[PDB]
Enzyme design. Sequence first.
Site, PDB file in Angstrom:
ATOM      1  N   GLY A 183     -29.803   1.564  45.919  1.00  0.00           N
ATOM      2  CA  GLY A 183     -30.452   2.819  46.232  1.00  0.00           C
ATOM      3  C   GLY A 183     -31.916   2.621  46.555  1.00  0.00           C
ATOM      4  N   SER A 223     -28.948  -5.050  45.468  1.00  0.00           N
ATOM      5  CA  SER A 223     -30.334  -5.508  45.378  1.00  0.00           C
ATOM      6  C   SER A 223     -31.095  -4.771  44.284  1.00  0.00           C
ATOM      7  CB  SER A 223     -31.032  -5.318  46.725  1.00  0.00           C
ATOM      8  OG  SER A 223     -30.772  -4.027  47.250  1.00  0.00           O
ATOM      9  N   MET A 224     -31.034  -3.441  44.292  1.00  0.00           N
ATOM     10  CA  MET A 224     -31.725  -2.676  43.261  1.00  0.00           C
ATOM     11  C   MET A 224     -31.032  -2.837  41.916  1.00  0.00           C
ATOM     12  SD  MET A 224     -33.766  -0.877  41.672  1.00  0.00           S
ATOM     13  CE  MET A 224     -34.878  -1.257  43.019  1.00  0.00           C
ATOM     14  N   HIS A 229     -30.805  -8.655  48.476  1.00  0.00           N
ATOM     15  CA  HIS A 229     -31.303  -8.713  49.843  1.00  0.00           C
ATOM     16  C   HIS A 229     -32.621  -7.956  49.913  1.00  0.00           C
ATOM     17  CE1 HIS A 229     -29.287  -4.823  49.763  1.00  0.00           C
ATOM     18  NE2 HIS A 229     -29.913  -4.490  50.877  1.00  0.00           N
ATOM     19  N   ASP A 288     -29.056 -11.441  53.312  1.00  0.00           N
ATOM     20  CA  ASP A 288     -28.125 -10.997  52.285  1.00  0.00           C
ATOM     21  C   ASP A 288     -27.392 -12.187  51.677  1.00  0.00           C
ATOM     22  OD1 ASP A 288     -26.292  -9.611  50.680  1.00  0.00           O
ATOM     23  OD2 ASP A 288     -26.115  -7.981  52.136  1.00  0.00           O
TER      24      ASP A 288
END
Lengths: 191, 191, 190, 190, 191, 191, 191, 179, 179, 179
Positions: free
Chosen positions: E67, E96-97, E121, E170
Amino acid sequence: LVPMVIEQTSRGERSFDIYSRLLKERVIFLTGQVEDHMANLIVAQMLFLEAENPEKDIYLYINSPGGVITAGMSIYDTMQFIKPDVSTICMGQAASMGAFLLTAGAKGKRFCLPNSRVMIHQPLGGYQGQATDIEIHAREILKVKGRMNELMALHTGQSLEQIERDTERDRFLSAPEAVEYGLVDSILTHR
Amino acid sequence: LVPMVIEQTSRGERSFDIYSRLLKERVIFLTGQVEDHMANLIVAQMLFLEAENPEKDIYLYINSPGGVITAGMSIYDTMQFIKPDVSTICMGQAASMGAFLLTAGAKGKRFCLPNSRVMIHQPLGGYQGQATDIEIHAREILKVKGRMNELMALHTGQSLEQIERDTERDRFLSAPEAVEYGLVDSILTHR
Amino acid sequence: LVPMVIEQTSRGERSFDIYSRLLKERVIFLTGQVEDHMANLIVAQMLFLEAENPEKDIYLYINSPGGVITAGMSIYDTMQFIKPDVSTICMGQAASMGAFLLTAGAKGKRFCLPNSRVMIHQPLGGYQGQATDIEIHAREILKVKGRMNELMALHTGQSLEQIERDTERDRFLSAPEAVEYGLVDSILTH
Amino acid sequence: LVPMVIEQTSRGERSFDIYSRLLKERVIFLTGQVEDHMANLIVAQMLFLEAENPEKDIYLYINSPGGVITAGMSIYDTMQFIKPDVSTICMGQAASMGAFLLTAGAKGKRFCLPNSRVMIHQPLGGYQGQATDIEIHAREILKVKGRMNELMALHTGQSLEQIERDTERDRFLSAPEAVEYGLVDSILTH
Amino acid sequence: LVPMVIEQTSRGERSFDIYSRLLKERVIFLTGQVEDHMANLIVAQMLFLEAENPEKDIYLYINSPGGVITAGMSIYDTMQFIKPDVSTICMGQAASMGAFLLTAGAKGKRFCLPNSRVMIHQPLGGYQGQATDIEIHAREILKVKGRMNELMALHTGQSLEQIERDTERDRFLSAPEAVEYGLVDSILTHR
Amino acid sequence: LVPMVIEQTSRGERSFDIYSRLLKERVIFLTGQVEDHMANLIVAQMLFLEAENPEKDIYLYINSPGGVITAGMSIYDTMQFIKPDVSTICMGQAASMGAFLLTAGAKGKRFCLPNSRVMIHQPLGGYQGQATDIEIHAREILKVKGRMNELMALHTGQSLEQIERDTERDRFLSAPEAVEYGLVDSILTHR
Amino acid sequence: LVPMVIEQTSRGERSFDIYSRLLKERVIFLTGQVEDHMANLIVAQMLFLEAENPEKDIYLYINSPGGVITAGMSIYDTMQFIKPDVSTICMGQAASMGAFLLTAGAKGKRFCLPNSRVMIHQPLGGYQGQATDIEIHAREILKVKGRMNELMALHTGQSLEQIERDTERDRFLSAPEAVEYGLVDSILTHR
Amino acid sequence: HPDVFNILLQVMDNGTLTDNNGRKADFRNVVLVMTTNAGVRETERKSIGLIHQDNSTDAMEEIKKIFTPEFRNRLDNIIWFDHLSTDVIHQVVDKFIVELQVQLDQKGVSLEVSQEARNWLAEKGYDRAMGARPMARVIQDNLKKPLANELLFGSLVDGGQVTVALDKEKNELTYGFQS
Amino acid sequence: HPDVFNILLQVMDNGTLTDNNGRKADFRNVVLVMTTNAGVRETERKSIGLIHQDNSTDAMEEIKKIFTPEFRNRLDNIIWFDHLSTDVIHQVVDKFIVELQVQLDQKGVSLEVSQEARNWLAEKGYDRAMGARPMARVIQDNLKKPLANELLFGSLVDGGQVTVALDKEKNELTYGFQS
Amino acid sequence: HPDVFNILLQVMDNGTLTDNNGRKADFRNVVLVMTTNAGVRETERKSIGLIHQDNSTDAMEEIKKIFTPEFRNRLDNIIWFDHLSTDVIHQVVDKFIVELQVQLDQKGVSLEVSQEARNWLAEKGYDRAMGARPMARVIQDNLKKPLANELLFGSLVDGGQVTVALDKEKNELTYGFQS
């Protein structure tokens, strides 16, 4: 959201919504376009008040821009049928089938605010199909037109001919002008 | 939102909805377009009232613009099955299905308000596909159409030919014109 | 909105929805197009009632105009491995899955109203894409169709060749015709 | 609207939902496309049941048509990690991920209904963008297929060669055929 | 719908939802895409648990697919500010988050299921407008990318250059690979 | 969903919401794009806390990405009106209006997390129609801009010329840099 | 989600929402576009307060961008009808029919915040159809305009000519300008 | 109710409680004992979640919230009981049988309970949730019911020679009677 | 009320009930029995279903619910009375007839009751909920009420020889009067 | 009950309280003292948030809610008692030791405790939330309990001369009975 108000009683304290608290005092709110669903609540409220106290008068604040003609008759028929006098007050705006209920109130218990406005017009509707079906649908509009003017004339007391000529097109009547027309008995400046 | 009402029971105060409170007094509201979900709710109310007091007669207020015929038939069969007399008081408007349920009420207990307007027509259905499918599908449309005529004549008492010709096209029957036709016994004004 | 009802129990008054009261009496309600969501609710009602009192019998009303085969099949399997006889009543209208679930009840317990209209037709479905995937997908639905006719013939008792022929296309069966066909009995109005 | 069952307890009467009352009897329902929120809800119920009674076996029904593979793993890993043996009663359609949970049940406790339909296929995913980016995602999805194929063989017991062979193309397996493949122990007797 | 679970107490039974009952046991749930609204709920739970017991460790399940980075800082900053150590368990997948919050847990309390995935990423934030405005916004996103890489290096233990190389494009890290990279101490199989 | 939290009150057990419990502790949460409805809710929380304990200080966590300018002024005016010092904390991100409220806190009570971000940009708006009307509206936007810069200068301490030149284009200020600009007093990494 | 608050009383603790708790202290929030439905809540709230205390002064926080003019008049009529002095406060912006209710307060009780902005303009409406119908509807908006100028002239004290002049086009009156133009008595910075 | 707890506060600190008539209840000699099962639920029940937290202090924390600090401060000591062990429960069965054996020994009826029967009664009689309270109930229905009937009429009235046993085929408890 | 149940629990455990006056009462030699007319309403409850043929036949479950679990543990066994059969009701009717015949012997008036007459009395005097309770009133209204009218004036004043019969079509009892 | 505070109004202002028979009491030479722990829980309450807030004001704000203004206006002064500090506990330990020496002086036993034992004992029982009542328990558990066994039977039956000292290695107290 609807606020919650407290009602202090000897038995104790009770919490009711802002609309339910006024409903306990025989005050009904007719807001928005007339419809079958909103009319059922108004009808159900009138029946509840009649059983609780069939002698006290019922107050109906009418702020509506108009709606379905069939749904309004349900409210109008109940107002006359029940013994209590259904007082009507025109708050903000009154239109076709919203103003009819205002004049439908018992004589001597109809009022309007000083800056309130009321309008009336003939029923507006349409149908698409074969010419045969359009004949029956068209006849219904004339039947309701004559009946609607007869009722407004019976309550307002104006001649039936006067209503049809004046209700052919939109007629905007201010709060003081409504008394001269006969829709309401006076202005609600004070009791 | 539906308003809340308080019932002063001997045990104590209890809060009920406007519809739930009226349901306690054997009152059902057939509001909104006919559908499977709304019709199923009415069936549940009838069964509950029957067990509570089978001797007492249930009251129903017909106010709807009509809808699917398949769902509405569930109310007809349940109404005759239950021992309590299902009074039918048309409020505001009665459509083809609404009128069909209006006639279903027990003889001597059906009523209509002075300004109520009734309407009856034939079932409207359509199907798309191969020619062979329309033939078998259309057959059921004629059967249900003819079947409704016999049920209408059982309560109304009119001849089959009279209902067939009138049901062929839309027919608007006002409150006094409906009592003469035989759909209802009389209007509810006083008692 | 769902109207509320009060029950005068020995302990005191209790308030709950109208559907909840009827559920207490083992009266399950099936309405609308069948789907994976309402299917679990119907099965959940059967499982809860079974644990409470398996000796008593459960009731089920059918007022659906159709639905998914996989979704409706979940309710059929529930009625089989439970001791309470699931009575089936057709209210208003039935369909491919409504009629299957209507005739799946215990013989004798199933009833029907006079003005009920039943409809039965083979499963309808389609798949688009690669020819290989369509072959397995198309070949699979034929097995399900034969399975439906096989289980339906068991409860009804009719021959497999007769039930499949009538179910090949749209077949409408009224209340009197349904009794002769063997799908349901007649309600005891008395 | 979900029903509101009533429970008889010595302390007093309590009102619960149909799903919540079933949760007391270690009965968990699964349906609809697998989602992150849906999966976390099933996981939360499993953790609560473990603390209540780590010995009493849990029951988990499956009637979902499949969903995201990533979220489904959270339910699988949770089922293995918890001490109670979570049975798997496939009551309806069971897709690849839906079937994966059915296989993940404790050995000797998995079940399926006679008319239940289970279909397993290789994980289906798509991605678009730059050539370098698609390569990374392409490698990842292949790794997921290997993990799903490897774990499927362990629970079912079938050779990895057969698992990866049939899973390539869309396959539909009935309930009786599932016993031959080792997917399920046996159908419910009654 | 959320199921309700009852916990026995001396005075009387208490009804709580499945998410609130687990919250009482210091078990937070981070599901779905990160947002300023959902993040506000996560930090609220952390602060509440700190007051209850500032010694017991918190457990934050992570099953989010990624997000906005702005909302993520609220959760990350809150975790470090509160004295209790937050245990991050990767359920299903960590984007990622999500991976950033996963590694942000206290050393020795970060775990991942054997079948869970961990993706990392660079930010995908984009801006449009005039060339002058793009330059200002473009310089800001690089700072966030560098800041995230520096914070990840502290927790993961890798050099800034290593994080830059892995985060340039990524990359999907399996559960065992996460232990090798240094995001978590080991798999959650025994306790 | 909102998790419930039990409070061990002296009187007895009491169940509260996650936000209601925090509101009891003078902790208000500002999230999402500023709007008339949500701004009114924040104002209501401030007025209620004022009478409960005016000696204490209110806390506000700003995590909004920016919104309507008119609604935001109601919050700022209420903060300065009430005697309690409305402490402001920037969680995750602070936009033009979010930053204007962050710096509006009393001196010595404004904090910002280390990884938090801030942004200040001139008001954005547009009008379409007659040229004369655009002139009236055009002056209004410029008038509002001068008001924010004049007020921001007092709280931050920078000259109005400095605010105007910098605010012509959006500027992103990190937590350390923000303290240098005068928006925040000190970082919230530790006290 | 509206947070809930506790009201400590000798009899016990009462849980009320934030909006309802403020209503207990004669505070009504007029936020959002004026409509027939929201108007009933403001009208119902004013009547509930009059019954509780017909001598204390009611307060109305106007933070609306304007809306239906006829619907808003129902609040103004009730404000002057009830004996209590309905004090008015301006939060944020005030537009057509928002400002009319802001200046309708009793003399010496109307106030505005220091940063509150006021906007005043003539009613805007459009109707399409027959030329006769357009003329009838045109006279209404013109008549309502004259009534608005006459009513505003009494409260503000400016001549009908001057208010009519400004109302031809939009006029954004700031907080100091409003006090000068008679819209309010003074500001609330120091009272 | 909390109103009752308030009455006990003065009892512990001052040792006296006043009544309606004003008589001072001087009972500083009586020992006060209270029994509660508040913290047992947290001890046996593990913490929800994949990871189990330290529940050693969780039991004491529950007593702090239930009982007010002033009440806990006046208590001299808190006696934490431990669950019965496998060997301890077996001795409880012997205790109950001794009361039945000595009760019938004076009457002249000898009782010889087999070891197998003692083990079976332990599991069925002792429930973890309800404790060993059903032991007296099962002992009454299993032993006192059949022996009591034959006591008035039959050979069991005299001679005794009662030998109880348990069959492995059905796990039921067999009965033996002789003159 | 709930407090009343606790009074019974104390005597069931200790066996001695104290008195405010100070008298000591012992229940060791006192047999205690209590009746509960519970579950009959649940059985006679009309089902809400459409068919209405649902029968409960599980009235024992309701008994355990109305009583607390603590009370159930003290009682060793509960007695359950099954519904009577129509044949057994016929014997109850004869009991009331015998008493009536004895009462008439003091005046020299006989009473003859046909086998068909008893069937009418049994059905009329037996109710599912109340059982044989209406039998006293039903016997009195049918037999004694008319009898007194004729006994006061008519042939039955002397001679006796009373006879009773019922018409088959209308199923109404007609009593012949002989001098 | 809050309604009971109204009785003390005239007592604090009028100085008299009439009884049922009209007799007027005199409180002019009476010292009125009231004890309450209302604001204690609010002060010790831990606030939720990033920035800790001082809850000292909550002490008086809670008292105002419990007692009406008319009741507090009559009060001469509201003295707020503070938690006992570590230094105060050292003096409290000496008080309990002196009280213990008075109990032993009746029997004839003399107790001498070293200063080192006092400091270790103070830290063991130092509880800020519980004030000084815990110090009684540590004295009871550590000093009185070993003495009770000897006073009844042993060397301390007659003569006393008890010595209490703590060895750093064990970190436990030592007791020497010299009869």
